[PDB]
């Protein structure tokens, strides 16, 4: 069947991460476009269409992240981790030229050194250790150590084309030592010592300028030095006279230089870097110096090359501009525009014909890198591609000329989600028509008899226009956005952690709304929750976001709509200290919406809704409402409970010793969930009642210490209502990742273990016995009871990077767990084979009533896959949402990609069936009347003629 | 309630089934009239039914008639020196009923099986249709009977209410079985249960067996039968009043000659 299917309702949408080192060579430039990121993927764009032709995910907790990326005429050359492995890659296809490992050093700077005609080598120059290997094959031969190592830094290596290799040392401060050595062997020619108390930096400052010219700034003395490494003796230091002398007062100054590797000589041009913004084009021939083309604003520069001429970008914040502090407005009508222009090196000439000019939507996004890619044709027109990177996470490409300036953008903030929710449709037209209509408060017969009428009179006038619209035809979805019979499209909202909202639909799977947050720095706690559905009318959807830091300690909270996108006029303050915990109550008031509350450092409930009803419910709870925190540093579990209006009060306290166990991960039981049967049948005909605690949390805690054979991982089940441990169960021989899942009353963790290379399956069940209790009013206080724990294990040989399992509304379906694989297949196993009534022994009455041999044996099959083409390169985790009609659940896999889906827990009971051809039926139908009548009249002249003869 | 259906799986299953059902019945009453064929009667046997009708009917009345006519007529009939019973003999078939064996099959045959071939309508129909939930009858059911009810969807924690389409036509049988009889008559022959069994007035009422036997056995009826002369008693007309007379004669003048 899912052949058939291929494509109806599923989509995959692909992403990468940010943009770090994309160059935009490839003179021919059919396509090409190569992108490396900063998570340990590198992708290749379509300059024309914009789709990803190749893309390669090594790595990302720690390790393999890509350091310098150099680019030949048709091979790329780059090293990953920090200078241990290093693998070629190619343009034309996709795959691996070479490879080649390195020495145990850090990793500073490599680039290329061309023997005499064109480069042979690449030269990579560590801490300490220095080394050479060859570009076309891979070859380590040239390697040696360097006079001075320990009080000696080396970066900006450079290279010239006649066959001697340089080398610049600056320590931080004290000397300059700069050193050179041949290229046809190991051979140190001689060495250059020079003093300078103010050169601190040369990662990234000084450049090599003209034919090895080594030039510096300097803004303590506002001086520019300038020394030859071929030739001379000593530096010469430059007064800056003849240009405006304004260096920024906190600001390090740095040097743009540009030097094309095929070419064997280099260019006398370089920007300055001034103050914020402060860029200017000066030319050094020997001893004078040449400025020109003051440029005042140019908030970015860019070079670029094609053949014996360069070119450099210049981008303005023109289009009425107003320059405030540090950002750009412009004052017409769209505001934040900015325009490209190019201009010449050799000369400060301006091109009339280039002139680019785009403005963004999203206030607050600044440019913070651009490419440039120019491109001779004809014979008297130049054409150049800018691409500017937004300052958040966002790509864009820009014509020369065309009816758009915008040809693809490409969003990729939206590889990295924390927090993802869905939320329904406002409602039908006519369905809100009608639910009008039926609203009565107050009336009599004779006002319903009326209504009724009405209703009917508009029902009339509602078909008689829909028949005279069959007659005649015999003879933007954001505004629209309307309901079916069966809700499956809905809206869902994505929060990224560099704090960009996005909304994007289910069924079309397009970028409908995407807010930019103020200001958030990396790792921030974000949640996300829905206060207010739908459903209703009076008024407008409520979504609350809650948001906090870790290093200062700042919590805020926005209320926005999920549905527009616009946030109301209502948000709280927030004092004190930073929100440890919220917690959201069912109870509704005000009009149709919820309450919540929040917890301060001080110990202190805040409630969000502040209405008097709202309190007054509260209060009337009173000693109803509990929480308990958790800690992994400190390892301190607690309980605290409301007391009248609104105090804390400590009831119960666990402690964890954390040098022995460590916490991890704590689940619990999901807050929209109903359980349809409350019991089980049993070998006779004898019913077996479960244990379902509403009110229960599961903690995981490992062993701090790691070795082959002493591990320690358990599971701690305590009732957040009082102190209580129900069931501790612990393992021996398991470590590494741990995954719990909580469901209605079964458990379900996975481990790993070292005595024999396996991953372990351990499912966990709690039952009651025969009898029932009160079975009307469950609470935590009374039930002095111990359920039964049932334990089983099973193998499975995957590494199970997500788990989830499928929740509908009412829970009649079956439960099935969706597993993630590192392959990006996803499959989705049934729960009743990993049962833990599974006897060992074939018994009779077992085998009779339901039931499989155990055996721990689980293997993948390859049928029982969801994912038959489309793949997760990293699935960071899986979202299930339950639909509304019975057995249909949404499956939205998040990580590197999106992919959406709809898993069908037990085939279809719902939906009229596919193959059902309707010619035959319509044929019976027929037939049968026709055969009816055909008979009577031949009984009608047999009951004649009988009666006649 | 719970489990929205479609509108599409009512208007294509519960309608065509009904129709299907209502149409298989009737095309199965005009088939059997159809169908219907005279069975051959002899002279012989004619007479004999003629005489034993007249017999039957002197045992019935035979109060109004006078006692020497009615000894006559009882004379006639046993008539020790010739007899009319006694002389006239016919061919004997020789029989194969016995007392014990047909005591027993009088329950034995019965009507047992003649649910069959409904069974084969229902699984044709449910063949046809795998997974699907046509309705729900409110009556509470026992979970023993959901393998017979759902047969072909695979759940276990869902009520046995819902009903598939096999059990949906199974109870659309019985339901016009009433109502056939309605557009029809008294006499209707639309039972789409009963396919197989003949059920009709019957051909040729009279059906002798064995003439012989059933000639003796209504002379020895009729000599068991004795004589009350129901016309002896007149004096209860004698003294009554005659008021019916004057009953339609006053609404015997308001009709005119037309
Ligand atoms: C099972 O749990 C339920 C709920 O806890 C129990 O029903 C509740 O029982 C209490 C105590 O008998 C009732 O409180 C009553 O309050 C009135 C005043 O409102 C007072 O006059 C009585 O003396 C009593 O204290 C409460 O109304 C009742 N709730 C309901 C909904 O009936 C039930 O007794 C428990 N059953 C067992 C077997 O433990
Ligand atoms: C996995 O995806 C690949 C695509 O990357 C599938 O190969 C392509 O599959 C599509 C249909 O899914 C083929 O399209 C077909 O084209 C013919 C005319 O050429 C048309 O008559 C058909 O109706 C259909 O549209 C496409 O040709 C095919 N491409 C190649 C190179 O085979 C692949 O089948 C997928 N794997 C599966 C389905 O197992």
């Known amino acids: ?949 | 309630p719970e489990l929205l259906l479609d509108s599409n799986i009512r208007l294509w299953v519960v309608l065509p089934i009904v129709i299907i059902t209502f149409f298989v019945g009737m095309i199965r009453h005009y088939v059997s009239i159809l169908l219907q064929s005279d069975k051959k009667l002899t002279q012989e046997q004619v007479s004999d039914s003629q005489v034993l009708i007249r017999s039957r009917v002197l045992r019935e009345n035979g109060k109004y008639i006078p006692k020497q006519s009615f000894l006559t007529r009882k004379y006639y009939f046993n008539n020790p020196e010739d007899g009319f019973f006694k002389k006239t003999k016919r061919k004997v078939v020789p029989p194969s009923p016995m007392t014990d064996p047909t005591m027993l099959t009088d329950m034995m045959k019965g009507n047992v099986t003649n649910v069959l071939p409904m069974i084969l309508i229902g699984g044709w129909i449910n063949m046809t249709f795998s997974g699907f939930v046509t309705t729900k009858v409110p009556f509470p059911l026992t979970l023993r009977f959901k393998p017979m009810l759902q047969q072909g969807i695979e759940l276990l924690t869902l009520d046995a209410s819902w009903v598939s389409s096999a059990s949906w036509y199974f109870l659309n049988v019985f339901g016009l079985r009433s109502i056939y009889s309605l557009i029809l008559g008294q006499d209707n022959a639309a039972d789409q249960s009963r396919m197989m069994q003949e059920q009709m007035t019957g051909a040729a009422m009279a059906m002798p067996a064995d003439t012989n036997k059933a000639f003796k056995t209504e002379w020895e009826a009729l000599e068991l039968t004795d004589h009350q002369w129901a016309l002896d008693d007149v004096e209860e007309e004698l003294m009554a009043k005659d008021l019916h007379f004057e009953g339609m004669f006053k609404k015997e003048l308001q009709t005119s000659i037309f």
């Open chain 1, 1 to 949: 069947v899912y052949e058939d299917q291929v494509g109806k309702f599923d989509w995959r949408q692909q992403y990468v991460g940010k943009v770090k080192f994309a160059s935009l060579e490839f003179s021919p430039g059919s396509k090409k476009l190569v992108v490396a990121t900063e998570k340990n993927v590198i992708a290749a764009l379509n300059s024309r269409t914009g789709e990803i032709l190749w893309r390669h995910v090594d790595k990302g907790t720690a390790e393999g992240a890509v350091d310098a990326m150099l680019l030949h005429g048709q091979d790329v050359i780059t090293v990953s981790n920090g200078g241990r492995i290093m693998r070629s890659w190619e343009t034309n296809i996709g795959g691996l030229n070479w490879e080649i490992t390195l020495d145990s050093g850090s990793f500073q700077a490599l680039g290329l050194v061309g023997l005499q005609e064109s480069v042979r080598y690449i030269a990579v120059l560590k801490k300490t250790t220095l080394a050479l290997h060859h570009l076309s094959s891979g070859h380590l031969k040239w390697v040696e150590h360097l006079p001075e190592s320990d009080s000696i830094h080396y970066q900006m290596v450079y290279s010239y084309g006649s066959g001697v290799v340089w080398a610049l040392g600056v320590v931080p401060f004290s000397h300059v030592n700069i050193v050179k050595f041949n290229v046809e062997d190991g051979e140190i020619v001689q060495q250059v010592r020079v003093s300078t108390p103010w050169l601190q930096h040369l990662s990234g400052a000084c450049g090599v300028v003209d034919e090895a010219v080594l030039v510096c700034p300097d803004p303590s003395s506002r001086s520019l030095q300038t020394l030859a490494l071929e030739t001379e003796w000593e530096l010469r230091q430059i007064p800056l006279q003849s240009l405006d002398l304004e260096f920024g007062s906190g600001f390090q100054p740095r040097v743009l230089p540009t030097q094309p590797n095929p070419v064997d000589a280099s260019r006398a041009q370089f920007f300055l870097h001034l103050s914020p913004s402060h860029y200017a084009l000066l030319q050094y021939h020997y001893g004078t110096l040449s400025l020109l083309k003051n440029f005042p604003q140019t908030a970015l520069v860019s070079f670029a090359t094609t053949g014996e001429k360069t070119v450099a970008a210049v981008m303005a914040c023109r289009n009425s501009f107003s320059e405030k502090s540090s950002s750009k407005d412009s004052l017409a009508c769209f505001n934040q525009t900015y325009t490209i222009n190019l201009y010449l090196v050799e000369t400060g000439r301006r091109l009339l014909d280039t002139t680019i000019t785009f403005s963004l939507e999203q206030s607050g996004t600044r440019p913070e890198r651009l490419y440039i890619q120019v491109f001779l044709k004809k014979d008297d027109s130049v054409g150049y591609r800018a691409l500017v990177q937004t300052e958040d996470h966002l790509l864009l490409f820009l014509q020369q000329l065309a009816g758009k300036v915008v040809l693809w953008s490409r969003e990729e903030s939206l590889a990295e989600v924390v927090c993802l929710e869905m939320v329904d449709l406002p409602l039908t037209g006519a369905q809100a028509e009608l639910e009008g209509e039926f609203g009565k408060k107050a009336d009599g017969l004779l006002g319903m008899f009326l209504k009724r009428l009405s209703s009917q009179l508009i029902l009339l006038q509602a078909w008689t226009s829909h028949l005279w619209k069959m007659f005649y035809d015999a003879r933007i979805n954001i505004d629209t956005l309307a309901r079916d019979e069966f809700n499956l499209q809905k809206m869902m909202v994505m929060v990224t952690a560099s704090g960009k909202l996005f909304g994007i639909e289910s069924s079309s799977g397009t970028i409908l709304w995407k807010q930019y947050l103020p200001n958030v720095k990396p790792d921030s706690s974000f949640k996300l929750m829905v206060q207010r559905t739908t459903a209703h009318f009076p008024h407008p959807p409520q979504c609350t976001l809650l948001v906090k830091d870790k290093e200062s300690g700042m919590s805020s909270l926005y209320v926005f709509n999920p549905i527009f996108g616009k946030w109301s006029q209502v948000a709280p303050p927030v004092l004190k200290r930073p929100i440890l915990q919220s917690l959201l109550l069912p109870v509704m008031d005000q009009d149709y919406a919820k309450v919540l509350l929040l917890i301060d450092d001080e110990y202190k409930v805040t409630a969000f809704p502040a209405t008097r009803n709202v309190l007054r419910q509260l209060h009337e709870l009173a000693p109803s409402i509990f929480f308990y925190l958790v800690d992994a540093e400190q390892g301190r579990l607690c309980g605290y409970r409301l007391r009248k209006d609104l105090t804390t009060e400590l009831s119960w306290e666990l402690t964890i010793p954390p040098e022995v166990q460590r916490i991890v991960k704590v689940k619990g039981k999901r807050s929209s969930e109903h359980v349809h049967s409350q019991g089980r049948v049993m070998g006779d005909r004898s019913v077996l009642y479960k244990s379902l605690n509403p009110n229960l949390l599961a903690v995981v805690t490992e062993s701090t210490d790691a070795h082959h054979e002493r591990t320690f991982i358990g599971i701690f089940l305590i009732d957040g209502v009082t102190g209580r441990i129900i069931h501790s169960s612990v393992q021996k021989k398991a470590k590494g990742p741990v995954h719990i899942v909580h469901s209605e009353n079964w458990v379900v963790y996975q481990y790993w273990n070292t005595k024999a290379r396996r991953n372990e399956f351990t499912v966990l069940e709690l039952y009651e016995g025969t009898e029932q209790y009160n079975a009307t009013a469950f609470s935590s206080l009374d039930r002095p009871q111990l359920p039964q724990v049932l334990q089983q294990s099973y193998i499975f040989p995957s590494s199970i990077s997500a788990m989830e399992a499928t929740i509908t509304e009412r829970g009649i379906t079956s439960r099935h767990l969706l597993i993630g694989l590192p392959s990006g297949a996803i499959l989705s196993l049934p729960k009743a084979l990993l049962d833990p009534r599974r006897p060992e022994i074939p018994t009779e009455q077992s085998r009779e009533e339901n039931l499989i041999p155990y055996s721990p044996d689980v293997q993948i099959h390859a049928e029982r896959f969801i994912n038959y083409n489309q793949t997760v390169s990293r699935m960071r985790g899986i979202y299930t949402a339950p639909s509304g009609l019975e057995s249909t659940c949404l499956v939205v896999a998040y990580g590197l990609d999106i992919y959406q889906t709809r898993v069908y827990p037990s085939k279809q009971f719902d939906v009229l069936k596919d193959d059902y051809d309707y010619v035959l039926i319509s044929s019976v139908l027929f037939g049968l009347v026709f055969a009816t009548m055909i008979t009577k009249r031949l009984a009608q002249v047999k009951l004649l003629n009988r009666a006649w003869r």
